Design a binder for these strands. Structure first.
Ligand SMILES: Cc1nc2[nH]c(=S)[nH]c(=O)c2nc1C
Length: 267
DNA sequence: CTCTTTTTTCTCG
DNA sequence: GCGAGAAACAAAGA
Protein backbone atom coordinates (compact mmCIF):
# COMPACT_ATOMS: atom_id res chain seq x y z
CA UNK A 1 0.00 0.00 0.00
CA UNK A 2 0.85 3.70 -0.46
CA UNK A 3 -0.37 6.69 1.55
CA UNK A 4 -4.02 6.63 0.30
CA UNK A 5 -4.44 2.94 1.13
CA UNK A 6 -2.83 3.39 4.56
CA UNK A 7 -5.06 6.39 5.25
CA UNK A 8 -8.12 4.32 4.25
CA UNK A 9 -7.07 1.59 6.70
CA UNK A 10 -6.42 4.24 9.36
CA UNK A 11 -9.95 5.63 8.99
CA UNK A 12 -11.67 2.23 9.16
CA UNK A 13 -9.64 1.28 12.25
CA UNK A 14 -10.34 4.60 13.96
CA UNK A 15 -14.08 3.97 13.61
CA UNK A 16 -13.91 0.47 15.00
CA UNK A 17 -11.10 -0.19 17.51
CA UNK A 18 -10.75 3.14 19.33
CA UNK A 19 -11.86 2.65 22.92
CA UNK A 20 -11.16 -1.09 22.81
CA UNK A 21 -9.10 -2.77 25.50
CA UNK A 22 -6.47 -5.24 24.29
CA UNK A 23 -7.17 -8.55 26.02
CA UNK A 24 -4.26 -10.46 24.51
CA UNK A 25 -1.67 -10.33 21.74
CA UNK A 26 -0.48 -13.44 19.90
CA UNK A 27 2.11 -14.02 17.19
CA UNK A 28 2.93 -16.82 14.82
CA UNK A 29 5.67 -14.60 13.31
CA UNK A 30 7.15 -12.65 16.25
CA UNK A 31 10.22 -11.63 14.20
CA UNK A 32 8.20 -8.88 12.49
CA UNK A 33 8.00 -7.05 15.85
CA UNK A 34 11.33 -5.24 15.46
CA UNK A 35 11.41 -3.96 19.05
CA UNK A 36 10.73 -7.40 20.57
CA UNK A 37 7.47 -9.35 20.68
CA UNK A 38 7.66 -10.33 24.36
CA UNK A 39 8.22 -6.68 25.33
CA UNK A 40 5.32 -5.52 23.12
CA UNK A 41 3.00 -8.17 24.56
CA UNK A 42 3.94 -7.20 28.13
CA UNK A 43 3.49 -3.46 27.60
CA UNK A 44 0.29 -3.41 25.52
CA UNK A 45 -1.80 -6.23 27.02
CA UNK A 46 -4.63 -4.67 29.04
CA UNK A 47 -4.17 -1.21 27.48
CA UNK A 48 -6.92 0.68 25.66
CA UNK A 49 -6.51 2.03 22.12
CA UNK A 50 -6.91 5.82 22.21
CA UNK A 51 -6.51 6.61 18.51
CA UNK A 52 -4.91 5.76 15.17
CA UNK A 53 -2.71 8.24 13.32
CA UNK A 54 -0.60 8.07 10.16
CA UNK A 55 2.69 9.55 9.01
CA UNK A 56 3.60 8.91 5.40
CA UNK A 57 2.93 5.21 4.83
CA UNK A 58 3.29 4.42 8.57
CA UNK A 59 0.29 3.58 10.76
CA UNK A 60 0.56 4.78 14.37
CA UNK A 61 -1.58 3.07 17.00
CA UNK A 62 -1.94 5.19 20.15
CA UNK A 63 -2.19 2.62 22.93
CA UNK A 64 -2.28 4.02 26.42
CA UNK A 65 -0.78 7.41 27.13
CA UNK A 66 2.87 6.38 26.84
CA UNK A 67 3.14 3.95 23.91
CA UNK A 68 2.62 4.01 20.18
CA UNK A 69 2.74 0.98 17.93
CA UNK A 70 4.25 1.98 14.58
CA UNK A 71 3.13 -0.37 11.81
CA UNK A 72 4.33 -0.48 8.22
CA UNK A 73 2.50 -2.69 5.75
CA UNK A 74 5.32 -2.54 3.15
CA UNK A 75 4.36 -4.38 -0.04
CA UNK A 76 1.42 -6.65 0.87
CA UNK A 77 0.46 -6.20 4.54
CA UNK A 78 -3.28 -6.39 5.30
CA UNK A 79 -5.37 -5.92 8.44
CA UNK A 80 -8.77 -7.44 9.08
CA UNK A 81 -11.24 -7.43 11.97
CA UNK A 82 -12.57 -10.91 12.67
CA UNK A 83 -14.65 -12.71 15.26
CA UNK A 84 -12.75 -14.41 18.08
CA UNK A 85 -13.41 -17.85 16.54
CA UNK A 86 -12.21 -16.91 13.06
CA UNK A 87 -9.93 -19.64 11.66
CA UNK A 88 -6.26 -19.00 11.02
CA UNK A 89 -5.29 -18.18 7.45
CA UNK A 90 -1.91 -19.17 6.06
CA UNK A 91 -0.23 -15.76 6.07
CA UNK A 92 -1.66 -14.45 9.35
CA UNK A 93 1.20 -13.38 11.61
CA UNK A 94 -0.12 -11.32 14.54
CA UNK A 95 -3.40 -10.82 16.31
CA UNK A 96 -4.62 -8.25 18.81
CA UNK A 97 -7.59 -9.78 20.64
CA UNK A 98 -10.38 -7.65 22.08
CA UNK A 99 -13.39 -8.77 24.09
CA UNK A 100 -15.69 -8.93 21.03
CA UNK A 101 -13.35 -9.52 18.08
CA UNK A 102 -9.75 -9.44 16.96
CA UNK A 103 -7.48 -7.45 14.68
CA UNK A 104 -5.34 -9.74 12.52
CA UNK A 105 -2.26 -8.74 10.53
CA UNK A 106 -1.38 -10.85 7.48
CA UNK A 107 1.48 -10.38 5.02
CA UNK A 108 2.32 -12.94 2.32
CA UNK A 109 5.85 -11.63 1.83
CA UNK A 110 6.55 -11.02 5.55
CA UNK A 111 7.96 -7.54 4.86
CA UNK A 112 5.70 -5.50 7.17
CA UNK A 113 6.94 -4.43 10.59
CA UNK A 114 5.71 -3.49 14.05
CA UNK A 115 7.69 -1.24 16.38
CA UNK A 116 6.80 -0.30 19.95
CA UNK A 117 7.83 3.34 20.55
CA UNK A 118 7.30 5.53 23.60
CA UNK A 119 5.09 8.56 22.97
CA UNK A 120 7.84 11.18 23.28
CA UNK A 121 9.99 9.17 20.82
CA UNK A 122 7.52 9.22 17.91
CA UNK A 123 8.62 12.58 16.51
CA UNK A 124 12.35 11.69 16.84
CA UNK A 125 11.59 8.35 15.13
CA UNK A 126 10.35 10.10 12.00
CA UNK A 127 13.06 12.79 12.12
CA UNK A 128 15.68 10.03 12.11
CA UNK A 129 14.09 8.50 8.98
CA UNK A 130 14.13 11.98 7.35
CA UNK A 131 10.49 11.61 6.25
CA UNK A 132 9.37 14.66 4.27
CA UNK A 133 6.17 16.66 4.64
CA UNK A 134 2.65 15.31 4.38
CA UNK A 135 1.18 15.89 0.86
CA UNK A 136 -1.17 18.73 1.77
CA UNK A 137 -1.24 22.40 0.81
CA UNK A 138 -0.65 23.34 4.46
CA UNK A 139 2.37 21.06 4.99
CA UNK A 140 3.99 20.63 1.54
CA UNK A 141 5.86 23.91 0.95
CA UNK A 142 6.64 24.41 -2.74
CA UNK A 143 9.49 26.84 -2.00
CA UNK A 144 11.55 24.25 -0.10
CA UNK A 145 10.55 21.55 -2.60
CA UNK A 146 11.93 23.71 -5.43
CA UNK A 147 15.22 24.38 -3.62
CA UNK A 148 15.80 20.67 -2.97
CA UNK A 149 15.12 19.83 -6.63
CA UNK A 150 17.55 22.53 -7.78
CA UNK A 151 20.38 21.17 -5.59
CA UNK A 152 20.14 17.53 -6.75
CA UNK A 153 21.22 15.59 -9.83
CA UNK A 154 18.94 12.66 -9.01
CA UNK A 155 16.24 11.53 -11.41
CA UNK A 156 12.81 12.79 -10.32
CA UNK A 157 11.08 9.41 -9.91
CA UNK A 158 13.71 7.75 -7.63
CA UNK A 159 14.03 11.02 -5.68
CA UNK A 160 10.25 11.20 -5.15
CA UNK A 161 10.21 7.55 -3.99
CA UNK A 162 12.79 8.29 -1.26
CA UNK A 163 10.03 9.89 0.93
CA UNK A 164 12.28 12.89 1.78
CA UNK A 165 10.83 15.54 -0.58
CA UNK A 166 7.28 14.60 0.43
CA UNK A 167 5.89 11.55 2.24
CA UNK A 168 3.63 8.84 0.86
CA UNK A 169 4.28 8.31 -2.85
CA UNK A 170 4.95 4.75 -3.95
CA UNK A 171 5.27 3.16 -7.37
CA UNK A 172 1.62 3.54 -8.44
CA UNK A 173 1.08 7.17 -7.52
CA UNK A 174 4.50 8.46 -8.57
CA UNK A 175 3.78 7.13 -12.09
CA UNK A 176 0.33 8.77 -11.97
CA UNK A 177 1.79 12.05 -10.68
CA UNK A 178 4.50 12.31 -13.33
CA UNK A 179 1.99 11.61 -16.09
CA UNK A 180 -0.31 14.28 -14.69
CA UNK A 181 2.59 16.75 -14.39
CA UNK A 182 3.97 15.80 -17.86
CA UNK A 183 7.43 14.98 -16.48
CA UNK A 184 9.73 12.20 -17.65
CA UNK A 185 10.58 9.84 -14.75
CA UNK A 186 14.30 10.06 -15.57
CA UNK A 187 14.29 13.87 -15.71
CA UNK A 188 17.17 15.18 -13.61
CA UNK A 189 15.58 17.37 -10.95
CA UNK A 190 18.04 20.24 -11.32
CA UNK A 191 16.75 20.60 -14.89
CA UNK A 192 13.12 21.17 -13.85
CA UNK A 193 11.96 24.75 -14.40
CA UNK A 194 9.82 26.63 -11.88
CA UNK A 195 6.52 26.20 -13.72
CA UNK A 196 7.04 22.42 -13.99
CA UNK A 197 7.89 22.16 -10.29
CA UNK A 198 4.70 24.06 -9.48
CA UNK A 199 2.58 21.64 -11.51
CA UNK A 200 4.41 18.68 -9.96
CA UNK A 201 3.78 20.03 -6.45
CA UNK A 202 0.06 20.58 -7.10
CA UNK A 203 -0.29 17.22 -8.87
CA UNK A 204 1.27 15.33 -5.93
CA UNK A 205 -1.32 16.84 -3.61
CA UNK A 206 -4.28 16.46 -5.96
CA UNK A 207 -3.61 12.83 -6.96
CA UNK A 208 -3.05 11.68 -3.37
CA UNK A 209 -6.07 13.55 -2.00
CA UNK A 210 -8.30 12.21 -4.80
CA UNK A 211 -7.01 8.69 -4.09
CA UNK A 212 -7.83 9.11 -0.38
CA UNK A 213 -11.38 10.22 -1.23
CA UNK A 214 -11.84 7.17 -3.48
CA UNK A 215 -10.61 4.80 -0.76
CA UNK A 216 -7.31 3.92 -2.44
CA UNK A 217 -6.65 1.30 -5.09
CA UNK A 218 -7.19 -2.45 -4.71
CA UNK A 219 -11.71 -8.69 1.73
CA UNK A 220 -9.59 -6.93 4.37
CA UNK A 221 -9.74 -3.32 5.54
CA UNK A 222 -9.02 -1.07 2.56
CA UNK A 223 -10.09 -3.45 -0.21
CA UNK A 224 -13.09 -1.17 -0.89
CA UNK A 225 -11.14 1.25 -3.06
CA UNK A 226 -12.24 2.85 -6.32
CA UNK A 227 -9.04 4.72 -7.24
CA UNK A 228 -7.81 1.84 -9.44
CA UNK A 229 -10.47 2.78 -12.00
CA UNK A 230 -8.97 6.29 -12.31
CA UNK A 231 -5.34 5.24 -12.91
CA UNK A 232 -4.12 6.69 -16.21
CA UNK A 233 -0.80 4.88 -16.69
CA UNK A 234 0.14 2.49 -13.88
CA UNK A 235 -0.15 -1.12 -15.03
CA UNK A 236 -1.64 -0.08 -18.39
CA UNK A 237 1.31 -1.00 -20.65
CA UNK A 238 0.35 -0.90 -24.32
CA UNK A 239 -2.99 0.84 -23.69
CA UNK A 240 -3.87 4.28 -25.03
CA UNK A 241 -3.03 7.53 -23.20
CA UNK A 242 -6.06 9.02 -25.00
CA UNK A 243 -3.34 11.30 -26.46
CA UNK A 244 -4.38 10.81 -30.09
CA UNK A 245 -3.13 7.22 -30.42
CA UNK A 246 -0.06 7.10 -28.17
CA UNK A 247 0.41 3.96 -26.07
CA UNK A 248 1.71 3.64 -22.52
CA UNK A 249 5.27 2.29 -22.31
CA UNK A 250 6.94 0.42 -19.46
CA UNK A 251 10.63 0.83 -18.64
CA UNK A 252 12.78 0.10 -15.59
CA UNK A 253 13.98 3.13 -13.64
CA UNK A 254 16.31 2.57 -10.66
CA UNK A 255 15.02 -0.99 -10.43
CA UNK A 256 11.29 -0.13 -10.51
CA UNK A 257 8.74 -0.85 -13.20
CA UNK A 258 7.81 2.52 -14.65
CA UNK A 259 4.74 3.38 -16.71
CA UNK A 260 4.70 6.61 -18.69
CA UNK A 261 3.36 8.25 -21.85
CA UNK A 262 6.43 9.24 -23.94
CA UNK A 263 4.65 11.91 -26.06
CA UNK A 264 3.46 13.80 -22.96
CA UNK A 265 6.55 13.09 -20.84
CA UNK A 266 9.62 14.11 -22.81
CA UNK A 267 12.72 15.33 -20.98
C1' DC B 1 13.41 -26.63 -14.55
C1' DT B 2 14.97 -20.93 -14.86
C1' DC B 3 14.03 -16.14 -14.76
C1' DT B 4 11.05 -12.23 -13.92
C1' DT B 5 7.50 -9.71 -11.61
C1' DT B 6 5.13 -7.34 -7.60
C1' DT B 7 8.76 -0.97 0.46
C1' DT B 8 12.58 -0.03 2.87
C1' DT B 9 17.35 -0.70 4.00
C1' DC B 10 21.90 -2.42 3.24
C1' DT B 11 26.42 -3.44 0.71
C1' DC B 12 29.68 -2.53 -2.73
C1' DG B 13 32.77 -0.02 -5.49
C1' DG C 1 28.37 11.23 -0.93
C1' DC C 2 26.59 8.50 -5.40
C1' DG C 3 24.07 4.73 -8.24
C1' DA C 4 23.47 -0.19 -8.86
C1' DG C 5 22.12 -4.06 -7.19
C1' DA C 6 20.33 -6.97 -3.86
C1' DA C 7 18.29 -8.57 0.51
C1' DA C 8 14.29 -9.47 3.38
C1' DC C 9 9.93 -13.11 1.32
C1' DA C 10 6.04 -15.62 -1.30
C1' DA C 11 3.55 -16.63 -5.23
C1' DA C 12 2.42 -16.38 -9.99
C1' DG C 13 3.48 -16.20 -14.76
C1' DA C 14 6.64 -16.55 -19.08
C1 LIG D 1 12.93 5.62 3.19
C2 LIG D 1 12.95 5.22 1.72
N1 LIG D 1 11.82 4.76 1.18
C3 LIG D 1 11.73 4.39 -0.13
N2 LIG D 1 10.58 3.94 -0.64
C4 LIG D 1 10.47 3.57 -1.96
S1 LIG D 1 8.93 2.97 -2.62
N3 LIG D 1 11.60 3.66 -2.74
C5 LIG D 1 12.76 4.11 -2.24
O1 LIG D 1 13.87 4.19 -3.09
C6 LIG D 1 12.85 4.49 -0.93
N4 LIG D 1 13.99 4.96 -0.36
C7 LIG D 1 14.06 5.33 0.94
C8 LIG D 1 15.38 5.84 1.50
Amino acid sequence: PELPEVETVRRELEKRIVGQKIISIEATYPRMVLTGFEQLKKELTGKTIQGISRRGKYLIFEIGDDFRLISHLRMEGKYRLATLDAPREKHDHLTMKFADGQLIYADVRKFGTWELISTDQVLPYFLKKKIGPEPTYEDFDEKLFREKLRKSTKKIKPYLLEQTLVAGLGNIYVDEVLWLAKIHPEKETNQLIESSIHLLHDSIIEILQKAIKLGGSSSALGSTGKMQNELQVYGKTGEKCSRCGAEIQKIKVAGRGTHFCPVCQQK
